[PDB]
Amino acid sequence: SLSDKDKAAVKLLWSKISKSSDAIGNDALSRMIVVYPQTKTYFAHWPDLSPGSPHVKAHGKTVMGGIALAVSKIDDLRAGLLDLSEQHAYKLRVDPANFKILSHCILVVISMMFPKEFTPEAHVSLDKFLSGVSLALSERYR
Amino acid sequence: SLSDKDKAAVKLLWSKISKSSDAIGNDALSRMIVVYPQTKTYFAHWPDLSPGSPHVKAHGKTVMGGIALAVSKIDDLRAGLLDLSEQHAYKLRVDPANFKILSHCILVVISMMFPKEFTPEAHVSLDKFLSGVSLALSERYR
Amino acid sequence: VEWTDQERATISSIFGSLDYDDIGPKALSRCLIVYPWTQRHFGSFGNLYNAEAIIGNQKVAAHGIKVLHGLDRAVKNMDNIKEIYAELSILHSEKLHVDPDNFKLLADCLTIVVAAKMGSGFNPGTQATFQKFLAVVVSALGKQ
Amino acid sequence: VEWTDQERATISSIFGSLDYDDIGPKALSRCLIVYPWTQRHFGSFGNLYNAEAIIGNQKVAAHGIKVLHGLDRAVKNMDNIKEIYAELSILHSEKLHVDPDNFKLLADCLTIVVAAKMGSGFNPGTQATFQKFLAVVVSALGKQ
Ligand code: HEM
Ligand code: HEM
Ligand code: HEM
Ligand code: HEM
**3-state SS track over C81-130:** HHHHCHHHHHHHHHHCCCCHHHHHHHHHHHHHHHHHHHHHHCCHHHHHHH
First to last CA, chain A: 21
Q: What is the DSSP letter of A54?
A: P
C45 near C53, Cβ under 8 Å? no
Write out chain B residues lying below 8 Å of C127, CB-based.
31, 34-35, 108
Method by which the coordinates were obtained: X-ray
Cα gap A104→A124, rounded to integer Å: 12
A96 near A141, Cβ under 8 Å? yes
CA–centroid distance for B12 within its chain: 17
Among C135, C85, C132, smallest CA distance to C106 is for C135
Q: Count of alpha carbons within 13 Å of C68, Cβ hemisphere only? A: 25
Residue of C nearest to B31 (CA): C124
Pocket (CB within 6 angstroms of ligand 2): B 39, 42, 62-63, 65-67, 84, 87-88, 92, 94, 98-99, 102-103, 133, 137
What torsion, rounded to 10 degrees, do the Cα atoms D112, D116, D120, D126 define?
Answer: -40
Write out chain A residues lying below 8 Å of D51, CB-based.
119-121
Secondary structure (3-state) at D43: coil
**Which alpha helices (H) appear in chain D, and where do they start and end?**
5-16, 20-34, 51-56, 58-76, 81-84, 86-90, 100-118, 124-142
Q: What is the DSSP letter of C42?
A: S
Kindly report the number of other CB atoms within 10 A of residue C87's CB atom: 9
Amino acid in position A19: K
Please name the residues in contact with B84: beta carbons below 8 A apart, sequence gap of 6 or more.
B66, B69, B136, B137
- How many separate domains does chain D show? 1
Please name the residues in contact with D91: beta carbons below 8 A apart, sequence gap of 6 or more.
none
Cα gap B16→B20, rounded to integer Å: 9
What are the structural domain ranges in chain A? 1-142
Q: Kindly report the backbone phi and psi dihedral angles of residue C142, in degrees, each rounded to the nearest multiple of 5, phi listed first.
A: -75, -10
Do the chains contact at D126 and B55, CB–CB below 8 Å? yes
A51 and chain B in contact, CB less than 8 A: yes
Write out chain A residues lying below 8 Å of C10, CB-based.
54
Q: What is the DSSP letter of A110?
A: H
Q: Count of alpha carbons within 13 Å of C79, Cβ hemisphere only? A: 5
First to last CA, chain C: 20
Kindly report the number of other CB atoms within 10 A of residue C18's CB atom: 16
Give the CA distances from residue A127 to residues A7, A42, C30, in Å, rounded to whole numbers and listed in that order. Answer: 12, 24, 47
Cα gap D36→D28, rounded to integer Å: 11
Cα gap A48→A43, rounded to integer Å: 9
- A82's enclosing H/E stretch is helix A82-86
DSSP letters, B38-80, are: GGHHHHTT-GGGSTTSPP-HHHHHHHHHHHHHHHHTTT-HHHH
- How far is ligand 2, taken at its centre, from the CA of residue B14, in Å? 19
Instruction: Tell me which CATH homologous superfamily contains domain B1-142.
Output: Globins (1.10.490.10)
B62-101 residues touching C, CB cutoff 8 A: none
Do the chains contact at D9 and B56, CB–CB below 8 Å? yes
Instruction: Count the helices and strands in chain B (H runs, E runs).
Output: 8, 0
Domain with C60, as residue range(s), is 1-144
Does residue A94's CB lie within 6 angstroms of at least one atom of ligand 1? yes
Kindly report the number of other CB atoms within 10 A of residue A24's CB atom: 23
Query: Taken in order C88, C91, C94, C100, is the CA torsion positive or negative?
Result: negative
Q: What is the DSSP letter of B115?
A: T
Does residue C109's CB lie within 6 angstroms of at least one atom of ligand 3? no
Does residue C75's CB lie within 6 angstroms of at least one atom of ligand 3? no
Among C65, C68, C31, C27, smallest CA distance to C48 is for C31
Cα gap A118→A46, rounded to integer Å: 29
Task: Give partners of D (≥3 CB pairs < 8 A).
Answer: A, B
Query: Taken in order A121, A25, D101, D5, is the CA torsion positive or negative?
Result: negative
Write out chain C residues lying below 8 Å of A53, CB-based.
123, 125
Query: Taken in order B69, B75, B80, B81, is the CA torsion positive or negative?
Result: positive
Cα gap D5→C18, rounded to integer Å: 43
B33 near B49, Cβ under 8 Å? yes
C65-124 residues touching B, CB cutoff 8 A: 108, 111-113, 115-120, 122-124
Shortest CB distance from C9 goes to which of A47, A52, A56? A56
A112 and chain D in contact, CB less than 8 A: yes
B59 annotated to bind ligand: yes
A53-70 core/surface letters (b: 16 or more CB in 10 A; e: else): bbbbbebbbebbebbebb
User: Radius of gyration over alpha carbons of chain C, in Å?
Assistant: 15
D68 near D28, Cβ under 8 Å? no
Kindly report the number of other CB atoms within 10 A of residue D144's CB atom: 8
Secondary structure (3-state) at C27: helix
Q: Whose CA is nearest to atom 36 of ligand 1?
A: A92
Among D75, A51, B48, D137, smallest CA distance to C123 is for A51
Give the CA distances from residue A14 to residues A7, A72, A110, B67, B133, in Å, rounded to whole numbers and listed in that order. Answer: 10, 10, 10, 42, 48
